[PDB]
Amino acid sequence: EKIKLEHGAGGEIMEELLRDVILKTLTLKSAGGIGLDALDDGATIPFGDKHIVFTIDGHTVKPLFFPGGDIGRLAVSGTVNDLAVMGAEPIALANSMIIGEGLDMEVLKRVLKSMDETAREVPVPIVTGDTKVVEDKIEMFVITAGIGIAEHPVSDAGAKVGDAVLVSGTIGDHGIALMSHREGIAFETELKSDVAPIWDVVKAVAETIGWENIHAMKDPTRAGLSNALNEIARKSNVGILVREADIPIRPEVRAASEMLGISPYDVANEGKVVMVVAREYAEEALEAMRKTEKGRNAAIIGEVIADYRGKVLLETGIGGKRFMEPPEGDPVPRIC
Amino acid sequence: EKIKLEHGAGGEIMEELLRDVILKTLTLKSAGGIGLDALDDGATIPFGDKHIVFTIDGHTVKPLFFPGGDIGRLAVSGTVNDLAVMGAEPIALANSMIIGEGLDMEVLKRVLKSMDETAREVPVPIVTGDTKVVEDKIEMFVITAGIGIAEHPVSDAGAKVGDAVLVSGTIGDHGIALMSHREGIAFETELKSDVAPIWDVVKAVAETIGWENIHAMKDPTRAGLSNALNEIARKSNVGILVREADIPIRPEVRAASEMLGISPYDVANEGKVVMVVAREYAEEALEAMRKTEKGRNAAIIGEVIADYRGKVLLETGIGGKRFMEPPEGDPVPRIC
Ligand SMILES: Nc1ncnc2c1ncn2[C@@H]1O[C@H](COP(=O)(O)OP(=O)(O)NP(=O)(O)O)[C@@H](O)[C@H]1O
Ligand SMILES: Nc1ncnc2c1ncn2[C@@H]1O[C@H](COP(=O)(O)OP(=O)(O)NP(=O)(O)O)[C@@H](O)[C@H]1O
Ligand SMILES: [Mg+2]
Ligand SMILES: [Mg+2]
Ligand SMILES: [Mg+2]
Ligand SMILES: [Mg+2]
Ligand SMILES: [Mg+2]
Ligand SMILES: [Mg+2]
């Protein structure tokens, strides 16, 4: 048996590898809070009356620079976002770089400058790092770890029947923008990735409704909105009913996705949060998101239900329903 | 200008890149304690009356499995050791893996099993991670970040005139074992890497003499003992006088290094600590090391002096002295 590209594609195939190989081989998996067996966006560790949150992502996106972002902005954003969706204020990042021999020095400078600019948006410092250079023809991989502090960690397993399901903005932008760039699809301008840190969006909701009323979050990265909704449903042992017409999709993204033959629900987003909130606080949460720039296109897209546990239903027309199927993998190679 | 293999070799060339490109491009570099500008083994962050310590290393060693270790044992050991030489008890690791398409599943399982076994030695849990798969022909890179807690962080810049300089064991084992394996050099058995976590050694000294009497530490990884001693001297603005005959070198390592034409002082070690301690506590520190298994071959090798600031002197014969020159880079490719 061999490792396949699908094992790195964020869908069912990767999930099976994590359950059957990673979780079964590693034995020391928790430091006292949310640990590896939870397979959540990060881990938590009790510290005083708060919690340290710890997360890591490798970044292998191609090309290194793309419309709306680059591997540097992605490395900072993705790790800040995994902290944010655990309910953690980012306090420090670590920057590992693995660089291909022969890369132009200006490319490294540009990636670093983008990392710094993006970090400054949060704000969060890059306090430690590492540099390796290999003869392999890889250009560059960037691996960021993050530490945050949460007063009240938010899991991906806390959804409750009756809760509202929100997304912080348009769906499909990153993956569709990336594929469009590769394929020479563009409109008046090129479609831009949404890659950005969204701690500001999460914090805005928390300050409005309180952490206790945010029941679940995930950032819909590899394998998309569909993967994120299916995982929350599965982990929370609930069904999720989504009204398809309420999912925000940029018109240019819809058009390009049609031309590409790719579902915008199944591709990574890089500047979004899926949030599940107490029913009575749904409108306040939505308003809090929409008051921010990065959450300006936020929408309530569905609700948590007691049946179809572990499944996601898509409602269309005047009431019809079908399943939103979780992808076997993100269909966009090297999306991340 | 292009990135060269030397930029990843841990010596003067890498150091110049860190000073002239990394530190000059990043602006947010500290979270309140030791930060990026210190270029120390990790960063520190005040938390309550203690300090969170944060570090990261990428691992790109070839081959993945070698005598005495593998990329998994290396990934856990190297990051635990960077925490330990900051004075931090390891509390959590993060495991990023970037895997080449086509790698045999059994290789991944073996690396994970080695990571777990090594983590169990500390003990420290692997609480979070990431998996990416690329089509590039890389086999595997493993990137570990670590969080530790220090009551009293130890810098690489705290050496004081009069202090004793210790090493926790034999010098040159990892780099020389690796090159010997590549070149088919072996004795009755193959030379083994020393790769191992050495938090136990550091902790043993601290429990004996107190953190305040441990003035500086570094693990002598890429570019070796010479690099580590030169960096401590430079950062502390002191000279270091070393008696060459007192540096422990395994007989097989000396022989192999002669055959290879490589200095054992200039190659990475992966199970060692260089420690600078208060003069009056030198013998207690040494005894504490030698009582442990991993520190069984520890030795006092020199002393900190007021002249030759930023330099390292090697004493031979009956008193003669020359400089221990810092390498431009570790001479062993893909050592780490
Ligand atoms: N190689 C690995 N070793 C240990 N834990 C892992 C590894 N790969 C993934 N995990 C864990 O598996 C879970 C799912 O990881 P992952 O899908 O990377 O999360 P994510 O970062 O939120 N999504 P993405 O940004 O697409 O990578 C998390 O709890 C990770 O900590
Ligand atoms: N790409 C990078 N970005 C930010 N900081 C970096 C980067 N590379 C190295 N650093 C910092 O530069 C200093 C020297 O790093 P490094 O030489 O990797 O330390 P080390 O881990 O103790 N030795 P080694 O195990 O051989 O890598 C540390 O303070 C790192 O945090
Ligand atoms: Mg996530
Ligand atoms: Mg992520
Ligand atoms: Mg390093
Ligand atoms: Mg170190
Ligand atoms: Mg290191
Ligand atoms: Mg990940």
GROMACS .gro file of N, CA, C and O in nm, chain A residues 127-129, chain B residues 10-12 14-16 18-19 23 34-43 82 85-86 154-161 163 215-219 221-222 226-240 274 276 304-312 326:
model
  272
  127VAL      N    1   0.776   3.442   1.642
  127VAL     CA    2   0.876   3.453   1.749
  127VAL      C    3   0.989   3.351   1.740
  127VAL      O    4   1.088   3.360   1.813
  128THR      N    5   0.974   3.253   1.651
  128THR     CA    6   1.071   3.146   1.640
  128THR      C    7   1.052   3.079   1.504
  128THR      O    8   0.947   3.093   1.442
  129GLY      N    9   1.153   3.008   1.456
  129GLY     CA   10   1.145   2.949   1.324
  129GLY      C   11   1.258   2.853   1.295
  129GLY      O   12   1.335   2.818   1.384
  346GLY      N   13   2.351   2.564   0.868
  346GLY     CA   14   2.368   2.593   1.009
  346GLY      C   15   2.491   2.672   1.050
  346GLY      O   16   2.512   2.696   1.170
  347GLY      N   17   2.572   2.712   0.954
  347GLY     CA   18   2.695   2.782   0.987
  347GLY      C   19   2.686   2.930   0.959
  347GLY      O   20   2.577   2.987   0.955
  348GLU      N   21   2.801   2.993   0.936
  348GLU     CA   22   2.807   3.137   0.912
  348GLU      C   23   2.717   3.183   0.798
  348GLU      O   24   2.657   3.291   0.806
  350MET      N   25   2.431   3.050   0.686
  350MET     CA   26   2.292   3.053   0.731
  350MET      C   27   2.270   3.170   0.827
  350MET      O   28   2.169   3.240   0.819
  351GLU      N   29   2.366   3.191   0.917
  351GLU     CA   30   2.354   3.297   1.017
  351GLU      C   31   2.342   3.434   0.952
  351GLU      O   32   2.265   3.519   0.997
  352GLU      N   33   2.418   3.456   0.844
  352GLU     CA   34   2.411   3.581   0.770
  352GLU      C   35   2.273   3.601   0.708
  352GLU      O   36   2.219   3.712   0.709
  354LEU      N   37   1.990   3.475   0.823
  354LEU     CA   38   1.897   3.505   0.932
  354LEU      C   39   1.905   3.651   0.976
  354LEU      O   40   1.803   3.717   0.995
  355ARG      N   41   2.027   3.702   0.990
  355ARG     CA   42   2.045   3.842   1.029
  355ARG      C   43   2.003   3.940   0.920
  355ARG      O   44   1.932   4.036   0.947
  359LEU      N   45   1.555   3.863   1.001
  359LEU     CA   46   1.535   3.962   1.107
  359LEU      C   47   1.502   4.100   1.051
  359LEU      O   48   1.436   4.179   1.117
  370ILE      N   49   1.194   3.628   2.537
  370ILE     CA   50   1.297   3.606   2.437
  370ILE      C   51   1.229   3.589   2.302
  370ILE      O   52   1.134   3.511   2.287
  371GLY      N   53   1.273   3.668   2.204
  371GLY     CA   54   1.207   3.670   2.075
  371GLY      C   55   1.302   3.637   1.962
  371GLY      O   56   1.413   3.588   1.985
  372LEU      N   57   1.260   3.667   1.840
  372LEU     CA   58   1.336   3.626   1.723
  372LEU      C   59   1.471   3.694   1.714
  372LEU      O   60   1.568   3.634   1.668
  373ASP      N   61   1.480   3.820   1.757
  373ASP     CA   62   1.606   3.893   1.746
  373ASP      C   63   1.719   3.830   1.829
  373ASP      O   64   1.836   3.849   1.797
  374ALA      N   65   1.683   3.755   1.934
  374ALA     CA   66   1.781   3.684   2.016
  374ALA      C   67   1.841   3.564   1.942
  374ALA      O   68   1.948   3.516   1.979
  375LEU      N   69   1.772   3.516   1.839
  375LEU     CA   70   1.817   3.399   1.762
  375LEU      C   71   1.858   3.282   1.851
  375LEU      O   72   1.959   3.214   1.825
  376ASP      N   73   1.780   3.259   1.956
  376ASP     CA   74   1.807   3.153   2.053
  376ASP      C   75   1.734   3.025   2.012
  376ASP      O   76   1.662   3.022   1.912
  377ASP      N   77   1.751   2.920   2.090
  377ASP     CA   78   1.692   2.792   2.055
  377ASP      C   79   1.540   2.795   2.051
  377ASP      O   80   1.479   2.715   1.980
  378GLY      N   81   1.479   2.886   2.128
  378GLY     CA   82   1.336   2.905   2.123
  378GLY      C   83   1.300   3.044   2.168
  378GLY      O   84   1.387   3.126   2.196
  379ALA      N   85   1.169   3.070   2.176
  379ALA     CA   86   1.117   3.197   2.226
  379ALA      C   87   1.050   3.174   2.359
  379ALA      O   88   1.009   3.062   2.390
  418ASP      N   89   1.557   2.145   2.188
  418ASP     CA   90   1.554   2.291   2.181
  418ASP      C   91   1.473   2.350   2.297
  418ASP      O   92   1.506   2.457   2.348
  421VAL      N   93   1.709   2.310   2.620
  421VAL     CA   94   1.822   2.402   2.631
  421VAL      C   95   1.777   2.547   2.653
  421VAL      O   96   1.861   2.635   2.670
  422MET      N   97   1.646   2.570   2.651
  422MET     CA   98   1.589   2.696   2.699
  422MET      C   99   1.547   2.685   2.845
  422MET      O  100   1.494   2.781   2.901
  490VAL      N  101   1.677   2.974   3.021
  490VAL     CA  102   1.820   2.980   3.004
  490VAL      C  103   1.851   3.020   2.860
  490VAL      O  104   1.805   2.957   2.764
  491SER      N  105   1.929   3.126   2.845
  491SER     CA  106   1.962   3.178   2.713
  491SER      C  107   2.091   3.116   2.663
  491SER      O  108   2.153   3.035   2.731
  492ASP      N  109   2.130   3.153   2.542
  492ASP     CA  110   2.261   3.119   2.489
  492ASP      C  111   2.359   3.236   2.507
  492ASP      O  112   2.471   3.232   2.458
  493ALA      N  113   2.315   3.338   2.581
  493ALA     CA  114   2.388   3.464   2.590
  493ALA      C  115   2.428   3.497   2.733
  493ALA      O  116   2.478   3.607   2.761
  494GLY      N  117   2.409   3.402   2.824
  494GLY     CA  118   2.430   3.428   2.965
  494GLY      C  119   2.562   3.384   3.024
  494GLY      O  120   2.577   3.388   3.146
  495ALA      N  121   2.658   3.343   2.941
  495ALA     CA  122   2.786   3.296   2.993
  495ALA      C  123   2.859   3.408   3.065
  495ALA      O  124   2.859   3.523   3.019
  496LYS      N  125   2.922   3.375   3.178
  496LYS     CA  126   2.995   3.474   3.258
  496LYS      C  127   3.142   3.434   3.272
  496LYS      O  128   3.174   3.315   3.274
  497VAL      N  129   3.230   3.533   3.282
  497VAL     CA  130   3.372   3.507   3.300
  497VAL      C  131   3.395   3.420   3.424
  497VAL      O  132   3.342   3.448   3.532
  499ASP      N  133   3.304   3.100   3.439
  499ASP     CA  134   3.214   2.985   3.430
  499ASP      C  135   3.283   2.864   3.367
  499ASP      O  136   3.374   2.878   3.285
  551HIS      N  137   2.406   2.906   3.332
  551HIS     CA  138   2.413   3.040   3.274
  551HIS      C  139   2.385   3.042   3.124
  551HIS      O  140   2.337   3.143   3.072
  552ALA      N  141   2.415   2.933   3.055
  552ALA     CA  142   2.389   2.927   2.912
  552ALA      C  143   2.381   2.782   2.867
  552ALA      O  144   2.444   2.695   2.927
  553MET      N  145   2.303   2.756   2.763
  553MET     CA  146   2.298   2.625   2.698
  553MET      C  147   2.271   2.641   2.551
  553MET      O  148   2.208   2.739   2.510
  554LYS      N  149   2.321   2.547   2.471
  554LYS     CA  150   2.272   2.525   2.335
  554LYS      C  151   2.289   2.377   2.306
  554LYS      O  152   2.378   2.314   2.362
  555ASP      N  153   2.204   2.322   2.221
  555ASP     CA  154   2.230   2.187   2.170
  555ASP      C  155   2.314   2.199   2.043
  555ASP      O  156   2.283   2.277   1.954
  557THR      N  157   2.371   2.116   1.740
  557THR     CA  158   2.310   2.058   1.621
  557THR      C  159   2.387   2.104   1.495
  557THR      O  160   2.510   2.093   1.493
  558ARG      N  161   2.320   2.154   1.391
  558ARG     CA  162   2.391   2.183   1.265
  558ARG      C  163   2.514   2.270   1.288
  558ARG      O  164   2.508   2.370   1.361
  562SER      N  165   3.162   2.324   1.746
  562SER     CA  166   3.230   2.449   1.713
  562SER      C  167   3.132   2.563   1.694
  562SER      O  168   3.152   2.672   1.747
  563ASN      N  169   3.026   2.538   1.618
  563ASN     CA  170   2.923   2.640   1.601
  563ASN      C  171   2.860   2.681   1.734
  563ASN      O  172   2.841   2.801   1.760
  564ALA      N  173   2.829   2.584   1.818
  564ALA     CA  174   2.760   2.613   1.944
  564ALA      C  175   2.849   2.694   2.038
  564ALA      O  176   2.802   2.791   2.099
  565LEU      N  177   2.975   2.656   2.049
  565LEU     CA  178   3.066   2.728   2.137
  565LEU      C  179   3.090   2.870   2.088
  565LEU      O  180   3.093   2.964   2.168
  566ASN      N  181   3.107   2.885   1.957
  566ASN     CA  182   3.128   3.016   1.898
  566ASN      C  183   3.006   3.106   1.916
  566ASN      O  184   3.021   3.224   1.942
  567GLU      N  185   2.887   3.048   1.906
  567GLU     CA  186   2.766   3.128   1.922
  567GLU      C  187   2.747   3.173   2.067
  567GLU      O  188   2.713   3.289   2.092
  568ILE      N  189   2.770   3.084   2.163
  568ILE     CA  190   2.761   3.121   2.303
  568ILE      C  191   2.863   3.231   2.336
  568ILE      O  192   2.830   3.328   2.404
  569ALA      N  193   2.985   3.218   2.285
  569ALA     CA  194   3.088   3.318   2.310
  569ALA      C  195   3.046   3.454   2.254
  569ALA      O  196   3.058   3.557   2.320
  570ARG      N  197   2.997   3.451   2.131
  570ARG     CA  198   2.953   3.571   2.061
  570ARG      C  199   2.836   3.639   2.131
  570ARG      O  200   2.839   3.760   2.157
  571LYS      N  201   2.733   3.560   2.163
  571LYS     CA  202   2.612   3.612   2.226
  571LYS      C  203   2.637   3.664   2.367
  571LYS      O  204   2.572   3.759   2.412
  572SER      N  205   2.731   3.601   2.437
  572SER     CA  206   2.763   3.636   2.575
  572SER      C  207   2.874   3.739   2.583
  572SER      O  208   2.902   3.790   2.691
  573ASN      N  209   2.937   3.769   2.470
  573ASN     CA  210   3.050   3.862   2.465
  573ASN      C  211   3.162   3.821   2.559
  573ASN      O  212   3.208   3.899   2.642
  574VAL      N  213   3.203   3.696   2.547
  574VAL     CA  214   3.311   3.641   2.627
  574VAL      C  215   3.396   3.553   2.537
  574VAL      O  216   3.357   3.524   2.424
  575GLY      N  217   3.513   3.514   2.585
  575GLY     CA  218   3.593   3.415   2.517
  575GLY      C  219   3.568   3.281   2.582
  575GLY      O  220   3.526   3.274   2.698
  576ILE      N  221   3.591   3.173   2.509
  576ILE     CA  222   3.582   3.040   2.566
  576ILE      C  223   3.712   2.967   2.539
  576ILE      O  224   3.757   2.958   2.425
  610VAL      N  225   2.547   2.144   2.531
  610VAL     CA  226   2.657   2.226   2.580
  610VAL      C  227   2.603   2.316   2.689
  610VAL      O  228   2.505   2.388   2.668
  612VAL      N  229   2.687   2.588   3.023
  612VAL     CA  230   2.781   2.677   3.088
  612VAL      C  231   2.730   2.702   3.229
  612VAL      O  232   2.616   2.747   3.245
  640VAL      N  233   3.511   2.998   3.061
  640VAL     CA  234   3.482   3.126   3.000
  640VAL      C  235   3.586   3.228   3.045
  640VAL      O  236   3.616   3.238   3.164
  641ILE      N  237   3.642   3.302   2.949
  641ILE     CA  238   3.746   3.400   2.978
  641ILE      C  239   3.706   3.540   2.932
  641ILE      O  240   3.615   3.557   2.851
  642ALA      N  241   3.775   3.641   2.985
  642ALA     CA  242   3.738   3.780   2.959
  642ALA      C  243   3.792   3.834   2.827
  642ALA      O  244   3.731   3.922   2.766
  643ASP      N  245   3.906   3.783   2.782
  643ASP     CA  246   3.960   3.824   2.653
  643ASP      C  247   3.917   3.730   2.541
  643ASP      O  248   3.847   3.632   2.566
  644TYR      N  249   3.959   3.762   2.419
  644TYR     CA  250   3.915   3.690   2.299
  644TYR      C  251   3.763   3.682   2.293
  644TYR      O  252   3.707   3.578   2.261
  645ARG      N  253   3.698   3.794   2.325
  645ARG     CA  254   3.553   3.799   2.329
  645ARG      C  255   3.492   3.759   2.196
  645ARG      O  256   3.535   3.806   2.090
  646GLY      N  257   3.394   3.669   2.201
  646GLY     CA  258   3.330   3.619   2.082
  646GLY      C  259   3.409   3.511   2.010
  646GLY      O  260   3.372   3.470   1.900
  647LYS      N  261   3.518   3.466   2.072
  647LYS     CA  262   3.603   3.363   2.012
  647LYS      C  263   3.616   3.240   2.100
  647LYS      O  264   3.589   3.245   2.220
  648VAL      N  265   3.658   3.130   2.039
  648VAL     CA  266   3.680   3.004   2.109
  648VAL      C  267   3.824   2.957   2.086
  648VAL      O  268   3.867   2.941   1.972
  662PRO      N  269   3.458   2.858   1.363
  662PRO     CA  270   3.319   2.825   1.330
  662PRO      C  271   3.306   2.795   1.182
  662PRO      O  272   3.358   2.869   1.099
   0.00000   0.00000   0.00000
